[PDB]
């Protein structure tokens, strides 16, 4: 009995492989060969958000493109006025082992979670003046690895228990549970139009989900190890994935397959982040080797380096308007580059 | 107006600096171990779908956060990357043989993986009384699972408890040797294993081992090790 379903699974996977091969008429590098490279895209540290007690794990830009919320293992989420480097809030967490934080597009809420499995939502605009927990989204059976807001009410979380969930922050319940991974779902990023999101997992495959339907539409594969980071290309129709295999890849949704891969024989450190600059011409990736590297997203080779960290960079958020790129670090400095 | 925002920033820095001293003086510890290990009873001994069960205890004006990890998947290689700045990873094993090989595989995994190279491992061989009874009654013969035990002999420098019979001495020292073999196989010295047999004293044992870790880190920092 079961062997029949195993055979059909194998042959369906073969159908998908054949169809993907049929679509591959010209790999990206071929069509992009003619354009001039981005050149020497060097950058310099303009600011440095000094003040965390311990290693950082997230640094997300508000929709105003000026505040950055940095979350650290010290049990702190600090909101940085990135032009002046003032600290506008310090948000003491319940459980200090944070692994992700997010800034709502309105700036009203800051979400944060980690090994506690509870995705907290903090309210910044309280009448009492001080920050306080608005809701605590209990319900996962594993560490809440990454989360982002769809809107002030709906938040989407990717967790260690292989699921992703669409919560309702007013009720606190899971309005929809996404499932289909076979490992830890270590990364997530909602698309620019918020109609769907992707989540990369330690099964080394990245899955695209639509929040209006509740199931994976497409599955992408090609890494040789866990996917540590994922990020949508600003067009909302392609996304980058970066893995502990020290290589990151560009997937195109309509192409249903990987189109370019960013690697150089001298890099062996595992990825930790991926993020495009607003035009989509620069792909920024964070590494365990203490550096962050700048990749020409279409000429498909390295074009710049960000340096000066003592430890690995935990996150590499780029501002909404593109004016800067932040880099959180395990040495506690949030370097702001431009 | 903006200078008032600068003052706000200074106030936040004062808050962070008052927290820095506490964070610095308080000691983080992980508590790994098999489900059948005594980690639960060790946590019960110590005194002041959730994924983590931080408990706090104090000895001689040093206080510790022991982070008993709760509901998480068994693929530890990810949620372990958070803990790679603890002062010591307590690992607890049931010394009663069989699944001891799984405990040894855990220890290998804990000792060697790439992020933990500077973290000392405190290994509580718990449940010692049950091992002793199981050996004494002959309910299981360790040779059945470790052929070397048929050729191994007690060390000439062992110090068993008075009244302890040589059988359980053979057993204990064998098992501790088998773990310490994994410990020494890295041959790098940058982190050290502290096995114990085990009450009331387990807190004091953690304190002693942590004292040694802190002393060695101090020597290493000053380039004087």
């Amino acid at each position, epitope marked *: 009995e079961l062997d029949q379903l195993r055979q059909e699974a194998e042959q369906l996977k073969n159908q998908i492989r054949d169809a993907r091969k049929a679509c591959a008429d010209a790999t990206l590098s071929q069509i992009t060969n003619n354009i001039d490279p981005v050149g020497r895209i060097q950058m310099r540290t303009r600011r440095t958000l000094r003040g965390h007690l311990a290693k950082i794990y997230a640094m997300h830009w508000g929709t105003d493109s000026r505040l950055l919320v940095s979350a650290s293992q010290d049990g702190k989420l600090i909101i940085w006025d990135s032009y002046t480097t003032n600290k506008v809030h310090a948000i003491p967490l319940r459980s200090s082992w944070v692994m992700t934080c997010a800034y709502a597009p309105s*700036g009203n809420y800051v979400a944060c979670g980690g090994l506690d499995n509870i995705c907290s939502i903090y309210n910044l605009k309280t*009448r009492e*003046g*001080n920050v306080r927990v608005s809701r605590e989204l209990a319900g996962h059976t594993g560490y809440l690895s990454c989360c982002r807001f769809l809107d002030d009410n709906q938040i989407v979380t990717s967790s260690g228990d292989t699921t992703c969930a669409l919560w309702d922050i007013e009720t606190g319940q899971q309005t929809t549970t996404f499932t289909g991974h076979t490992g830890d779902v270590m990364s997530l990023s909602l698309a620019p139009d918020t109609r769907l999101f992707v989540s990369g997992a330690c099964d080394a495959s990245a899955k695209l989900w639509d929040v209006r339907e509740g199931m994976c539409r497409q599955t992408f594969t090609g890494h040789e190890s866990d996917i540590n980071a994922i990020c949508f290309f600003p067009n909302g129709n392609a996304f980058a994935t970066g893995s502990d295999d020290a290589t990151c890849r560009l997937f195109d949704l309509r192409a249903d397959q990987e189109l370019m891969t960013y690697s150089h024989d001298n890099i062996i450190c595992g990825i930790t982040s991926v993020s495009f600059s607003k035009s989509g011409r620069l792909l920024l990736a964070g590494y365990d080797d203490f550096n962050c590297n700048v990749w020409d997203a279409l000429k498909a080779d390295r074009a710049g380096v960000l340096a000066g960290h003592d430890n690995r960079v935990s996150c590499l958020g780029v501002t909404d308007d593109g004016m800067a790129v932040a880099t959180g670090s395990w040495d506690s400095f949030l370097k702001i580059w431009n | *107006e903006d200078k*008032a*925002a600068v*003052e*706000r920033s200074k106030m936040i820095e004062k808050q962070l600096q008052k927290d820095k001293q506490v964070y610095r003086r308080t000691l983080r510890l992980l508590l790994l171990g098999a489900d059948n290990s005594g980690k639960s009873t060790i946590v019960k001994q110590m005194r002041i779908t959730s994924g983590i069960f931080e408990t706090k205890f104090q000895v001689d004006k040093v206080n510790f956060h022991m982070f008993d990890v709760g509901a998480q998947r068994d693929e530890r290689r990810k949620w372990i990357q958070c803990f790679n700045d603890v002062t010591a990873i307590i690992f607890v094993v049931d010394s009663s043989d069989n699944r001891l090989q799984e405990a040894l595989n855990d220890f290998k995994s804990i000792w060697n993986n790439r992020w933990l190279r500077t973290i000392s491992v405190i290994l509580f061989l718990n449940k010692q009384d049950l091992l002793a009874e199981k050996v004494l009654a002959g309910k299981s013969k360790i040779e059945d699972y470790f052929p070397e035990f048929a050729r191994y002999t007690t060390p000439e420098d062992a110090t068993p408890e008075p009244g302890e019979d040589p059988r359980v001495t053979r057993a204990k020292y064998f098992i501790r040797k088998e773990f310490v073999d994994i410990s020494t196989a890295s041959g790098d010295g940058r982190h050290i294993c502290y096995p114990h047999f085990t009450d009331t004293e387990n807190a004091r044992r953690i304190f002693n081992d942590c004292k040694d870790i802190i002393l060695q880190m101090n020597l290493r920092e000053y380039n004087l090790v």
Partner: single-chain antibody
Amino acid sequence: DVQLVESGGGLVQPGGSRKLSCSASGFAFSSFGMHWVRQAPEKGLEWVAYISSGSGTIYYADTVKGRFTISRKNTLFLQMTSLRSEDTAMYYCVRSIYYYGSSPFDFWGQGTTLTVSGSDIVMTQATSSVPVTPGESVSISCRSSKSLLHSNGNTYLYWFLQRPGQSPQLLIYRMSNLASGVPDRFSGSGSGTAFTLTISRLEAEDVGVYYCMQHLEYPLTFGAGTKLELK
């Protein structure tokens, strides 16, 4: 609820001394800067004193310096000495927390009466009273001796409404931002030295006297204020 209650005022002979008090609840008092603002029985508002969060700094008005003194346990105190005839006024406790996007002066106390038996930035208004009717739309204006645009690009005008016989409320802060809980009927604009506030589809809840205020530098001089009155 967020709440402020000042207390301790009363009748004083000229040259006397007294302590005014402010009490707070429902908000993280120690992180707020606390102001004092006063109102003569037949005049516009005047700024009095400021004490920052954590007591980092203190200021006073040019006609108040030294004679009064301020200190902040969810309470604040206002020392007074050599009390003048002109010190007769209704005194309001005012909170203000300062950071990017913050909303200073967002809450005013009930107010205590106390009765005694040129380098500044100064405000003026080309009007003192205006007829208005519900359903109609109205406007007001305010003018400055200095351009209130700080080098960072914010214009630091603040608009307050004093409904008759009660505490003021913040209408618009830094010359564009509508304060929370304010009906969306309001709007405002700023042009460096000259500023306006506008009401579309008035309702009787908006009747009262309107005070503009500059916040670029101490002392925080209020304008004389414009009355908008029914029919």
